[PDB]
Design a protein around this ligand. Sequence first.
Ligand code: HEM
Ligand SMILES: CC(C)(O)c1ccccc1CC[C@@H](SCC1(CC(=O)O)CC1)c1cccc(/C=C/c2ccc3ccc(Cl)cc3n2)c1
Ligand SMILES: CCCCCCCCCCCCCCCC(=O)O
Length: 463
Amino acid sequence: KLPPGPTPLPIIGNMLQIDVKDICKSFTNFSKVYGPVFTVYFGMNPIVVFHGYEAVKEALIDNGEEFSGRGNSPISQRITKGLGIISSNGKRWKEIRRFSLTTLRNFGMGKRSIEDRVQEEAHCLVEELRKTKASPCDPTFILGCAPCNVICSVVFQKRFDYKDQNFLTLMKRFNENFRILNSPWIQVCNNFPLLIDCFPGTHNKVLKNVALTRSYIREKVKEHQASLDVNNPRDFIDCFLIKMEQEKDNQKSEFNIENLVGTVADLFVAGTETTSTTLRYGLLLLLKHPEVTAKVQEEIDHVIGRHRSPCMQDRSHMPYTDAVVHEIQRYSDLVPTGVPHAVTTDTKFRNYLIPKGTTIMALLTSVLHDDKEFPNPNIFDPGHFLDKNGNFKKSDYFMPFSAGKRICAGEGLARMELFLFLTTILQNFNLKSVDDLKNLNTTAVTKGIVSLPPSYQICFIPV
Ligand code: HEM
Ligand SMILES: CC(C)(O)c1ccccc1CC[C@@H](SCC1(CC(=O)O)CC1)c1cccc(/C=C/c2ccc3ccc(Cl)cc3n2)c1
Ligand SMILES: CCCCCCCCCCCCCCCC(=O)O
């Protein structure tokens, strides 16, 4: 008894009724014809889509457990092999996530807090930006090296030097796979597996980058083993190695060198491109909206000054900069469809029964753009996260990190990098448009699962 929906054609399903590019605009129109919940078939596979705050919440939150499964697929499977945190499910997930969540706490990796790794990075970033010499440029590459280096710093103790070859290769690697896997073709090939054979070259490249990466990590993990100081862990690998030590006897324990190379890999994948995107998107918005930046720089001056580096602690005294960072995520809507889930067993959702394994889809964007909770949801405006007094106004509708039992495993780190990197930049630079702001477009290109901001150029003018 799946929820209603467009009756499918045989063999293909509703495919030709869904714009594979902006598949969310497609879903939104379906909702106006079948309501909050509904089923669509990609190929022979059913997919029950949830639209609106109440549907997404009732599902993800209220029925948390049953909706905490990761919808998987032919591609996702052959890349990860069910290893790691993102793609795993059941027992192996719960144990890896729980270990990951606590090991990723501000101090969960030893004497050196993560904030300190982020703050040091926000530094090198500002230094690289000075190198542009105020000249117009595409911030994409520079902005990407920071979030990627933060992860390096979190899993490999030390951060790389931007010119270091290993870092550049480590990046291209992940970027290439990011671009491949973000093609509308992925949605097709995932449902019509046979069509993967039609992409020999691309198939090999993806697997090759994945293969090479695993090697590098493993080579790097041995370095950690042969130098492990059990009493004070250096990074993420140390913590895992220590945990592995304890389970030494349990032959069915998840903590083995295999999930370690996996979970590490996942960390880059899960926190590099997403952060980089929101960052690049955030600057574009601060550029397009000058009267906004001015206020943020005003808080920065008033609460941090030119006297020192911003730290997470200032955020409690900077309501506006907080509203901005919240509105940047709400507006830029990084993952409109959220990441596909799957119900854990036969699940009951008001009048409907959803078979175990079915693919779920909680449309985050439908929440982030609720027109009642956010009047004029399509205009970037910090007011959305501000009360009549200029005080921060938290929202239950703020789900860019998703919700429920499978909410972003690195939200904190994510929120920390956005606030640090963004305030640290605005402190040392002012944003200048190569052209006229009016000629500046801020509409995303959703030719894929990860919405992207339009390409642009900017001039970092040292204050
Ligand atoms: C701009 C920043 C980021 C955003 C908006 C974002 C958001 C997301 C979203 C929407 C999900 C899927 C949640 C679901 O299952 O429904 C996710 C999960 C995940 N994120 Fe992020 N992310 C970002 C950065 C980070 C960072 C910096 C890390 C690194 C620690 C991280 C690691 C993860 C991991 C490991 C998962 C998979 C969790 C699981 O399946 O149990 N994320 N993220
Ligand atoms: C990548 C992204 C968008 O930043 C992200 C961030 C946080 C959480 C999820 C995601 C989506 C990652 C999704 S891509 C899903 C797709 C559809 C499907 O197969 O079901 C679009 C193909 C995903 C889910 C589970 C595991 C993975 C593992 C990826 C991975 C694993 C190891 C890798 C080693 C080297 C390289 Cl160069 C790339 C590697 N990539 C990816
Ligand atoms: C083991 C993992 C295999 C993954 C195979 C993924 C196959 C899908 C390849 C899609 C390639 C799309 C290339 C077109 C790029 C473009 O010009 O838009």
